[PDB]
């Protein structure tokens, strides 16, 4: 003799529709806690998301008037006692770290409480708060200490679930303020700053355009596949692709060669600024093949050293070039002075082998 969850949801809606009382939604909180203890061992977590929506409506009830610790402190205190989401069910072999997601949201609420209420300890470098008393952070250095301990314990514990790759792919990629709050040389924290910064370059840009802004200060005034001299140049000289403004703020266009101005070893590059397009290859003087090439221009400087290539069906011919082209404008007549002919352009010479362009760091295409 029982009734299902539809009567529970309809009775919750009818108890919400009952009005004119003057409580702090205790009539809602009674049925919310009864539905919470009815919604624990289901291994479902959707009614835990409904409990999170109940916590959101309770947060809006506290947030109807909460400002400047006159009642913002009351709203943060009500949320810190409303951390019974973490203090009701907490078990291993549960339904995949929904408590870790809820504790992450509650840690964001507590960081907003410590980051808000005037004070100081700016441990976010973004000031989430906006215009307008547990005492966990009694100092600004202790504000960084008590929160980086919080944001590292709650980082990979949410990765214990099924593979979402959601928070620690971003927030543990947000360890820029973990050591470069004030301390300059982040060689200790070089696991994500200047190691795998391309995961937002391969994703959508302008996130990594500030991540690489602090992935150069670990090598701007600091010395000593973690062995390099200037081989961190994909983040230094090949950061001009994400640098949309080059004619303004040309310190991203000066330091590409100023890092190499006292260089010395090679690498690869995309040549995604200067495009290259072919043309009608003609004939020339004695043993001069002389293909025709057109090259674009988006980088600043000149005086390259380059050659073209064209593989046959057996061996490469490497139909060379003058290697002093000095590309300043688009679609210019590159000379492509080519010798050592592989059988008079034998018609299986399909132009597949790349047209590199080296300025001590090679740029294959």
């Amino acid at each position: 003799p029982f009734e299902s969850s539809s009567k529970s949801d309809e009775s919750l809606g009818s108890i919400i529709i009952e009005g004119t009382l003057d409580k702090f939604q205790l009539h809602k909180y009674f049925f919310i806690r009864r539905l919470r203890l009815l919604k624990l061992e289901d291994q479902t977590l959707t009614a835990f998301v409904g409990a999170f929506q109940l916590i959101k409506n309770f947060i809006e009830s506290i947030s109807i008037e909460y400002r400047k610790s006159v009642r913002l402190l009351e709203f943060k205190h009500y949320f810190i006692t409303s951390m019974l989401s973490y203090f009701e069910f907490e078990n291993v072999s549960n339904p995949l770290l929904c408590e870790i997601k809820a504790e992450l949201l509650m840690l964001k609420r507590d960081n907003w409480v410590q980051g808000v209420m005037a004070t100081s300890g700016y441990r976010l470098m973004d000031k989430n708060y906006p215009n307008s008393k547990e005492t966990f952070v009694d100092e600004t250095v202790f504000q960084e200490n008590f929160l980086t301990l919080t944001k590292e314990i709650l980082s990979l514990f949410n990765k214990c679930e099924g593979k979402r790759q959601r928070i620690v792919d971003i927030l543990s990629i947000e360890i820029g303020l973990l050591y470069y709050q004030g301390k300059k040389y982040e060689e200790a924290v070089s696991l994500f700053l200047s190691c795998y910064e391309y995961y937002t370059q391969t994703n959508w840009n302008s996130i990594g355009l500030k991540i690489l802004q602090v992935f150069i200060d670990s090598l701007s005034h600091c010395p000593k596949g973690e062995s390099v001299s200037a081989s961190a140049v994909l983040t230094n000289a090949f950061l001009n692709i994400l640098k949309l403004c080059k004619d303004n703020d040309s310190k991203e266009i000066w330091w590409k060669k100023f890092m190499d101005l006292q260089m010395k070893v090679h690498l690869a590059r995309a040549n995604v600024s200067a495009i290259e397009v072919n043309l009608k290859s003609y004939g020339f003087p004695e043993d001069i093949s002389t293909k025709t090439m057109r090259l674009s221009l988006k980088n600043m400087g000149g005086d390259v050293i380059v050659f073209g290539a064209s593989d046959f069906l057996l061996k490469k011919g490497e139909n060379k070039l003058i290697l002093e082209c000095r590309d300043i404008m688009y679609g210019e007549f590159s000379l492509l002075s080519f010798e050592i002919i592989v059988e008079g352009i034998t018609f299986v010479k399909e132009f597949p082998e790349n047209q590199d362009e080296f300025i001590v760091v090679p740029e294959i295409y």
């Binding site: 959101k56 947030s63 971003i170």
Partner: protein
């Protein structure tokens, strides 16, 4: 009544435009928070057993979230793989249901604006540059610039 950003992502998980109103003429650098909120919602597509979708007839306004000063959600139509999201600033938030269906219907207005500008053949091969400026130029009057209409 005013969104705090407008974000557009297609089916390849490539963000089309993370548009923020009023980054010039007003406060900068919170756009650096705005696009990483968009990326948090992008890898927060479905996580920790929370399901937004149960009605397959029309894709309605799905599950609200709230995170570090904003209130975001998602509206996956599932038609041509469009994954567009809108946040709101929690400061000026009344939290009613006509508000909830109001932001549902203005989500369908920005859906209408995208599907109008998607098939304007007055300029053809508008897919990389000034299609974005044109759609921003159609964004920035539907929620703001009402100040002089009267």
């Amino acid at each position: 009544l005013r969104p705090c950003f407008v974000s557009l992502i297609d089916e390849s998980d490539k963000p089309i435009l993370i548009y923020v109103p009023n980054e010039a003429e007003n406060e900068m650098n919170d756009v650096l928070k705005y696009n990483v909120l968009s990326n948090i919602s992008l890898d927060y597509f479905e996580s920790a057993l929370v399901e937004w979708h149960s009605l397959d007839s029309k894709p309605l306004l799905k599950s609200i979230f709230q995170l570090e000063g904003v209130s975001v959600f998602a509206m996956l139509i599932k038609q041509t793989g469009l994954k567009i999201v809108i946040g709101f600033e929690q400061k000026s938030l009344s939290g009613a249901d006509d508000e909830f269906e109001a932001i549902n219907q203005i989500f369908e207005t920005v859906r209408k604006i995208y599907i109008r500008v998607k098939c304007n053949p007055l300029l053809v091969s508008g897919d990389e540059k000034s299609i974005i400026k044109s759609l921003e130029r159609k964004f920035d009057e539907l929620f703001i610039s009402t100040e002089v209409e009267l």
